[PDB]
Design a protein around this nucleic acid. Structure first.
Lengths: 293, 229, 267, 11, 213
RNA sequence: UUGUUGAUUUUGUGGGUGGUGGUGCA
């Protein structure tokens, strides 16, 4: 299609192909919505190729892509208003990721990154996260937003709120955390779970639409690893790191107490204790103004 | 461990004026300034630009250099102490004209424009702001003492006088009092221009100092002594 | 009943003071039922009406009021009604410095785990409270810990030893705002909110570092915000511009089940 | 506001 | 001894007047000035705001007349905005009337040097780094940078190493002219400083720090 | 497409260069 309608062949081919930067993106998202568990390897081959083609198309028709991308943002929000999580699918996660691929994430203002970050933050808070599918969707959402701020390292409060509720969800309350608002008390992990076997922390997207204990643990560990990365990158720089980690530290202490073998919180707790020790906690000095002439 | 004041916002310090005699300040007197005008239009007599005219006047053109005054006032007025509002400049022209320099003024840095200001000031006896709210440069009646603060220490720059540390003298001097410095903008001459007013003369360095350098040298010590930064 | 008590019930009674026990019980209600947790907020309006009319004192009002402020308050729909009452209560001329300091500290303690809309709500509120009570302005800025260029070397050493031994004295579990020792603490949350992802929220957070020239901020201009407003605002951008693309290239967007832009998310 | 080494405007 | 670029061991205070606005134009060659030549520079299309070499003159005057220069512990370098680097012999004594300074500069730029009977003013090859001492600390004057005490700063630095300060004689612009060579930028005074004043302030600290007197 | 001419230009897409430059040397 691109060859048959290159800019040189005829007038208006530039205007057309810009729309095919938009149409290709929709096709990319549509393919992700389609089932591909049968031929994941083939889907991987075709998918990355299409994204590469869109990257070249975006380089010359970035304007048309942004219009389509934002229109998709307007569409998901409207679908979220009436359907809530049912509107959200794998492709919505894929759209958020491809935006990160093609658009400058580390910007104070951006036409497409900013609405995506706001829209995703709305999911991280508004969505009930009352099912392992829903928790799995949130975990992928946390990973995507973390990659957006991989250089900027800005603070997302919704990431803290999402972490706190999910951590308490898998321990259900302990009667010590009434400030955290849970939406499902039936997802508590059983005590008999080993927490010593080597469990892959990767969450397939095709299993998401289909959606036992092991799957819950893998989702937890992925959420645990994202939490550790957030502590290691963004939270440490913030002046209030000690406070930001207190609710998590108490949650992490509960994880160790209930599951002594389960090592990840002890690791995170050790790094947290390590970082708190260096971090110099000062009474802030912020009203220091420059004398005037 | 202390609660912060009611209002921390920095406010511009009151602009010091001759009427106010209580506040501590560092006064600098640029004595023996060579500022003269003559109709050719009235032009500030200059050492290099005009040579024959000053010969016709009979004045030794060696002492016909206002650029020294221009630089000294430039180095002075741009000093942080002015920006802190703790300095007032007085200019005593060789003819006997006393000029008060409001700390708010800003002389043009270009010498040619500076000459235009001086001829404007000398003939109109005053210079008004662009916004027309205050008279930045005003000629005032002699003697100098009446304008100076009631309690003030007077000193001149004397190369023959003992060499001192400008910082040290300012701390041992009392607080409510003010310090007045008489600097000779003359290219050369005897350091007796301010003898009748001053009480004691000091030298600042073993080696000879330019008037602009000495003026800049003195103010830096005061800023160090008074923590003006 | 509590919603209409202040308007359609109290004025029609001969001795409305008799409602004090019911409102006091309503104001002190603590239940494990989540939906019953909002009862004290509604009862506060009627309780204040009784105190205002007959000059009644509820025992330990501001201790109980400090207790009520909680994460659920920022999310419930009656937050606007509550804050309107807060502006009346916290306009009193006799409130102690430790009193207001605890409320600011706990609200800042909450804004960390709050939505931006709630953050947009609180940040003007803390500005107004601090401006009302300049003694609490120490919380934003403690001068003794400044490193001044002219400070002598022994002062530098004393600051360093004082620096090392400092500990935050604010108590989160203490229910008495005059005992929380908040006035001796400081607001690190607002400085962390300075790095908020949303630029406008960060700008509102950057205001504290700027001088407090403004006398006060209109609360009505900041209460009504939410996720939809931010999304709706971006849905209608008056100006449209080419986006800045990534020069970096990732071979695969997602992880497998070369370069992966989402490790941990299988494809 | 003029700052530093600025010269006054010339008309 | 008179300090020179060849000698690198000795401690000294190096000052570089970066972005110096010195340029010669013939209608005969004459130094361009903001006031003397306006219509000509308007025809060039360059703004007369950045046509002001007297800052280099004033800064060079205060630097040259400072006690440190008399004490033989200071050398001056000037980096013209066009890219011309000039070495200033400490022994020189420039004219103080701006008109005679301009005539000297056109002589310096066109003959590439000045000899009066060593070369008083000599144009040297860039970069600056080769000319500067082997062990030397580099700083610029930056208003946004933290305010530091020049006396305390010089005291805390070592003895064998030398100090470079990069001062902007330019009228307006970003303080990045010497970012490539410098390792850190420091603030001298809490308030905005003119180039001459900052140069006057800095040599004060070295004189106090080294007891030059 | 040209001031009557005929593929020299015109439209769209990509696209490099200071260059009838000056000046000092052998």
């Amino acid at each position: 299609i691109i060859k048959a309608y290159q800019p040189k062949l005829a007038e208006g081919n530039k205007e057309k192909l810009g729309k095919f930067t938009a149409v290709l993106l929709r096709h990319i998202i549509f393919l992700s919505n389609q089932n591909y568990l049968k031929n994941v390897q083939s889907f991987k081959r075709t998918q990355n190729a299409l994204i590469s083609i869109l990257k070249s198309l975006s380089e010359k028709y970035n304007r048309e892509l942004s219009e389509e991308c934002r229109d998709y943002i307007n569409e998901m929000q409207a679908r979220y208003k009436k359907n809530h999580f049912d509107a959200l699918s794998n492709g919505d996660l894929v759209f958020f990721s491809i935006i990160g691929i093609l658009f400058s994430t580390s910007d104070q203002y951006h036409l497409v990154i900013t609405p995506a970050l706001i829209l995703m933050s709305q999911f991280l808070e508004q969505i009930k996260f009352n099912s392992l599918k829903r928790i799995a969707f949130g975990a992928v959402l946390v990973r995507i937003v973390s990659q957006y701020q991989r250089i900027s390292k800005r603070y997302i409060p919704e990431v803290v709120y999402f972490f706190q509720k999910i951590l308490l969800t898998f321990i259900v309350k302990p009667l010590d955390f009434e400030n955290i608002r849970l939406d499902s008390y039936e997802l508590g992990l059983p005590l008999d779970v080993d927490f010593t076997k080597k469990r892959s922390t990767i969450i397939p997207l095709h299993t998401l639409s289909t959606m036992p204990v092991d799957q819950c643990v893998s989702v937890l560990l992925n959420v645990m690893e994202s939490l550790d990365a957030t502590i290691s990158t963004v939270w440490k720089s913030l002046p209030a790191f000690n406070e930001i980690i207190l609710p998590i530290q108490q949650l992490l202490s509960a994880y160790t107490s209930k599951y002594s073998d389960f090592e990840k919180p002890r690791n995170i707790l050790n790094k947290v204790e390590k970082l708190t020790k260096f971090t110099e906690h000062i009474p802030l000095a912020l009203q220091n103004h420059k004398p005037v002439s | 461990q202390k609660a912060l004041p009611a209002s921390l916002v920095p406010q511009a310090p009151p602009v010091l004026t001759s009427k106010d005699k209580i506040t501590k300040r560092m006064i600098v007197v640029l004595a023996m300034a060579s500022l003269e005008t003559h109709k050719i239009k009235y032009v500030l007599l200059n050492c290099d630009d005009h040579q024959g005219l000053l010969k016709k006047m009979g004045r030794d053109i060696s002492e016909a250099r206002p650029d020294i005054t221009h630089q000294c006032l430039l180095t002075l007025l741009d000093s942080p102490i002015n920006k802190a509002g703790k300095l007032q400049v007085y200019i005593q022209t060789s003819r006997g004209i006393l000029i008060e320099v409001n700390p708010t003024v800003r002389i043009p840095r270009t010498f040619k424009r500076f000459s235009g200001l001086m001829v404007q000031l000398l003939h109109k006896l005053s210079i008004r702001s662009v916004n027309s709210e205050e008279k930045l440069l005003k000629v005032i009646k002699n003697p100098i003492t009446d304008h100076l603060p009631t309690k003030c220490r007077k000193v001149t720059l004397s190369f023959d006088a003992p060499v001192i540390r400008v910082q040290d003298y300012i701390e041992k001097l009392d607080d409510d009092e003010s310090i007045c410095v008489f600097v000779g903008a003359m290219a050369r001459g005897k350091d007796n221009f301010a003898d009748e007013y001053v009480d004691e003369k000091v030298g600042l360095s073993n080696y000879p100092l330019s008037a602009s350098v000495a003026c800049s040298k003195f103010c830096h010590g005061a800023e160090d002594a008074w923590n003006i930064l | 009943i509590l919603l209409i008590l202040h308007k359609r019930i109290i004025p029609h009674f001969h001795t409305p003071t008799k409602l004090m026990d019911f409102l006091t019980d309503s104001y002190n209600l603590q239940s494990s039922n989540k939906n019953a947790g909002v009862v004290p907020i509604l009862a506060l309006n009627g309780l204040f009406e009784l105190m205002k009319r007959f000059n009644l004192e509820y025992p330990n009002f501001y201790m109980k009021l400090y207790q009520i402020i909680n994460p659920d308050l920022m999310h419930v729909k009656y937050r606007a009604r509550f804050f309107r009452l807060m502006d009346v209560f916290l306009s009193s001329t006799h409130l102690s410095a430790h009193l207001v300091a605890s409320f600011i500290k706990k609200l800042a303690r909450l804004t960390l785990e709050s939505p931006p809309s709630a953050i947009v709500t609180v940040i003007p509120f803390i500005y107004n409270l601090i401006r009302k009570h300049p003694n609490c302005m120490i919380m934003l800025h403690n001068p003794a810990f400044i490193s001044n260029p002219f400070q002598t070397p022994d002062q530098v050493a004393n600051l360093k030893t004082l620096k090392e031994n400092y500990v935050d004295p604010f108590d989160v579990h203490e229910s008495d705002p005059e005992l929380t020792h908040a006035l001796d603490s400081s607001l690190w949350e607002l400085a962390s909110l300075m790095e908020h992802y949303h630029p406008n929220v960060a700008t509102l957070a950057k205001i504290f570092a700027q001088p407090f020239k403004k006398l006060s901020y209109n609360m009505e201009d900041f209460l009504d915000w939410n996720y939809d407003s931010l999304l709706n605002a971006e849905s209608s951008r008056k100006l449209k511009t080419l986006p800045t693309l990534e020069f970096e290239a990732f071979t695969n967007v997602f992880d497998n089940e070369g370069n992966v832009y989402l490790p941990g998310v299988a494809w | 506001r003029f700052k530093g080494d600025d010269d006054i405007p010339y008309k």
